[PDB]
Amino acid sequence: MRIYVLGAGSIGSLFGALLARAGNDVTLIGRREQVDAINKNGLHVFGAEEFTVKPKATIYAPEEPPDLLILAVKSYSTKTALECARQCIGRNTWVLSIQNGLGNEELALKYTPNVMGGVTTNGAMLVEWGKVLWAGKGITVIGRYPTGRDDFVDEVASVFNEAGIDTSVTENAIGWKWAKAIVNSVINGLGTVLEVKNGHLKDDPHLEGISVDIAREGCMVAQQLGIEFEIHPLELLWDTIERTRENYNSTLQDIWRGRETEVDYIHGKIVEYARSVGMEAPRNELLWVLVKAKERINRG
Amino acid sequence: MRIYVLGAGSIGSLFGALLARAGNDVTLIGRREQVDAINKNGLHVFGAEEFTVKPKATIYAPEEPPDLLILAVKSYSTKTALECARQCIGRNTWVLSIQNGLGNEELALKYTPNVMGGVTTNGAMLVEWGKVLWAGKGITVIGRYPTGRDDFVDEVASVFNEAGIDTSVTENAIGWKWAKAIVNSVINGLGTVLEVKNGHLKDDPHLEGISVDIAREGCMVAQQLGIEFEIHPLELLWDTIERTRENYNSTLQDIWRGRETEVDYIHGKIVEYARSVGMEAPRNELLWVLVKAKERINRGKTR
Numbered sequence: 001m002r003i004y005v006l007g008a009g010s011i012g013s014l015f016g017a018l019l020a021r022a023g024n025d026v027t028l029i030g031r032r033e034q035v036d037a038i039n040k041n042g043l044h045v046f047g048a049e050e051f052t053v054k055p056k057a058t059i060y061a062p063e064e065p066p067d068l069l070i071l072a073v074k075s076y077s078t079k080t081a082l083e084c085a086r087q088c089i090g091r092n093t094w095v096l097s098i099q100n101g102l103g104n105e106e107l108a109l110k111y112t113p114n115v116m117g118g119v120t121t122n123g124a125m126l127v128e129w130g131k132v133l134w135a136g137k138g139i140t141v142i143g144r145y146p147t148g149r150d151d152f153v154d155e156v157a158s159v160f161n162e163a164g165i166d167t168s169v170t171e172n173a174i175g176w177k178w179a180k181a182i183v184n185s186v187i188n189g190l191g192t193v194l195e196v197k198n199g200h201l202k203d204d205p206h207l208e209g210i211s212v213d214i215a216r217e218g219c220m221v222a223q224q225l226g227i228e229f230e231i232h233p234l235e236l237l238w239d240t241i242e243r244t245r246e247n248y249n250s251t252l253q254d255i256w257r258g259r260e261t262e263v264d265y266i267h268g269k270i271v272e273y274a275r276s277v278g279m280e281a282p283r284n285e286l287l288w289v290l291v292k293a294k295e296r297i298n299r300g
Numbered sequence: 301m302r303i304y305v306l307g308a309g310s311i312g313s314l315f316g317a318l319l320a321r322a323g324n325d326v327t328l329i330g331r332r333e334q335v336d337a338i339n340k341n342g343l344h345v346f347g348a349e350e351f352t353v354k355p356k357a358t359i360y361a362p363e364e365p366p367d368l369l370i371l372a373v374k375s376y377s378t379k380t381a382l383e384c385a386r387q388c389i390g391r392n393t394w395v396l397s398i399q400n401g402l403g404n405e406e407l408a409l410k411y412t413p414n415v416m417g418g419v420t421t422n423g424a425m426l427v428e429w430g431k432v433l434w435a436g437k438g439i440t441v442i443g444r445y446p447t448g449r450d451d452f453v454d455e456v457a458s459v460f461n462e463a464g465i466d467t468s469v470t471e472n473a474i475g476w477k478w479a480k481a482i483v484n485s486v487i488n489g490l491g492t493v494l495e496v497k498n499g500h501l502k503d504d505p506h507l508e509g510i511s512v513d514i515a516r517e518g519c520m521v522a523q524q525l526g527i528e529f530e531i532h533p534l535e536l537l538w539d540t541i542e543r544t545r546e547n548y549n550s551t552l553q554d555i556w557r558g559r560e561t562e563v564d565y566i567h568g569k570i571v572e573y574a575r576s577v578g579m580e581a582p583r584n585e586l587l588w589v590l591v592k593a594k595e596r597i598n599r600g601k602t603r
């Protein structure tokens with residue numbers, strides 16, 4: 001399959017490298033430093049598995065359409081990234097987002113009806129230009145957005161699985177994007193404001209209790225929007241924590257490193273969607289403000 | 301007036317010092333370290349004003365009943381304080397709480413019917429034993445609890461004003477206690493979680509906005525309980541932030557000392573009352589949990 005990865009950072013590099021190793025026609029689109037490193041010395045994966053590949057790399061999407069465009073930029077980059085890559089979206093090109101946050105698939109739908117949504121629990125970190133840590137193995141779920149099925153989604157899933165990307169197909173992609181966002185709202189909210197490891201959210205019984213309330217808040221918004229869940233967000237929440245007990249969440253890591261966070265597309269979107277249908281998401285709103293305020297305080 | 305200040309922390313020390321300077325017969329009842337410092341080197345106030353006075357100080361309640369007993373301890377110690385002082389609560393002794401939070405007056409009423417509720421928006425910090433930083437010059441309002449009037453309440457307000465404690469009398473003290481509780485829910489919640497001075501909550505427009513939402517939540521709970529306000533809690537909020545903008549709030553101070561915090565008596569009380577009338581108080585509930593979580597994380601550590 002011809003695949004362009006738009007956003008050759010941590011998760012984009014991991015997916016691109018695995019897809020390339022399996023023999024797919026892969027092009028990574030990203031930062032100059034990343035492109036130059038890869039073109040010079042290839043792309044190195046270490047951690048859960050160790051190997052080197054040399055996919056194509058460029059700072060700008062080719063005009064030639066791929067079978068698949070994977071969106072792997074941060075959510076605050078999606079709108080512009082699509083504007084800068086629209087030349088490659090052909091009549092038959094599908095766009096898959098494996099991004100956290102909400103609304104990315106909607107942005108892609110502006111350009112084509114051929115959109116899939118995805119969630120991955122793989123963990124990755126680009127530690128140097130051209131060197132990505134496969135920090136943890138996990139499942140990937142993809143589906144026609146917002147719901148239903150398509151032969152090409154099935155193909156993508158097979159390609160993924162053959163490359164060692166464990167992948168399941170869902171006919172409720174939107175449910176999964178929202179379930180992930182709700183889980184992120186709890187972990188990336190509480191863990192960041194308190195600066196604690198994910199496991200602490202379960203160990204302090206009061207944090208465990210408020211986690212449920214935050215999750216229920218997101219679930220109720222979803223339900224009012226007509227969204228249903230294939231897997232319960234609460235189940236996903238506790239499973240996610242159980243597996244990442246000693247980790248600091250990615251939002252907290254962003255702030256520590258002086259990088260922009262994605263909370264506008266997590267808490268922010270839950271809040272915005274709630275308002276549109278006559279609800280509030282007060283806990284999400286407070287977490288949103290606290291995390292953004294913490295960021296401003298640190299920056300300055 | 302013969303006045304015993306029960307609790308020799310920052311606010312108790314500030315009130316005791318001001319009342320002593322004015323010539324009142326003042327005794328501070330508190331912990332050994334503070335008591336010893338006051339008896340040895342006097343009580344020194346600095347910041348908003350700078351002066352030194354030497355009130356009496358003791359770890360034990362005097363036998364003689366005072367005209368006025370001022371509760372100034374943190375709210376988690378109100379029961380301990382009243383037990384320490386129970387023998388000096390005479391038939392004509394009034395107890396005034398100027399404490400943060402809700403419910404302190406109700407605890408005092410278990411000992412005597414002579415209870416007044418008080419709010420003060422002064423900001424203070426005990427920086428060394430015997431040395432209090434007056435970080436924000438606020439206002440004080442006192443009244444017969446929960447409502448109504450009494451000649452002695454008026455007399456106390458007169459004494460306070462004479463001593464430079466700017467004070468008004470209210471016939472709706474319970475409403476004032478709730479207004480201050482709502483103000484503290486914003487300041488001691490947001491300021492503590494973010495670990496910033498009070499002024500930052502007004503400076504950041506996004507914090508400003510969420511502050512309104514938190515205040516409204518508390519006001520709606522109060523309305524359901526039949527509480528009426530003489531002063532808009534939002535006005536009290538902005539006034540208080542301006543008057544104490546350089547202060548780190550008392551809850552944050554406790555966190556930094558690895559102490560227990562008062563939040564059970566602020567956010568916790570708002571949430572508990574809310575739930576009793578079928579209301580969530582979601583913002584207060586989250587702040588409650590966040591601050592108590594920080595309390596537990598920092599407990600026993602001095603930062």
Ligand SMILES: *SCCNC(=O)CCNC(=O)[C@H](O)C(C)(C)COP(=O)(O)OP(=O)(O)OC[C@H]1O[C@@H](n2cnc3c(N)ncnc32)[C@H](O)[C@@H]1OP(=O)(O)O
Pocket residue numbers: 306307308309310311329330331334359360361372373374377380381383384385425426553554557559
């Ligand atoms: S019953 C009579 C005999 N006394 C006893 O048996 C002991 C129990 N009774 C008492 O301690 C006092 O009678 C009461 C009034 C209950 C408490 O006295 P204080 O109010 O003076 O003492 P506190 O500990 O409650 O707080 C006073 C200030 O001291 C500072 N502070 C307390 N704890 C710490 C720690 N761990 N580290 C640094 N500083 C600490 C605080 O600044 C506190 O002032 P705040 O303004 O509240 O912060």
Ligand SMILES: NC(=O)c1ccc[n+]([C@@H]2O[C@H](COP(=O)([O-])OP(=O)(O)OC[C@H]3O[C@@H](n4cnc5c(N)ncnc54)[C@H](OP(=O)(O)O)[C@@H]3O)[C@@H](O)[C@H]2O)c1
Pocket residue numbers: 006007008009010011012029030031059072073074075077080081082084098099100101120121122123124125126262
């Ligand atoms: N890392 C993980 O383990 C993981 C796992 C699951 C999901 N996710 C989600 O996947 C998404 C990406 O995460 P990430 O950790 O991989 O972020 P990342 O390391 O910052 O990688 C994103 C890359 O895309 C680049 N980029 C931005 N705009 C671009 C554009 N027009 N063209 C080309 N490149 C562009 C970015 O560069 P600049 O920074 O300079 O803009 C960055 O290098 C997020 O939504 C994340 O939540 C990540």
Ligand SMILES: CC(C)(CO)C(=O)C(=O)O
Pocket residue numbers: 400420421422423424436438484487488498540544547548549550551
């Ligand atoms: C008035 C104010 C908010 C001063 O900070 C206070 O009551 C406190 O610190 O608890």
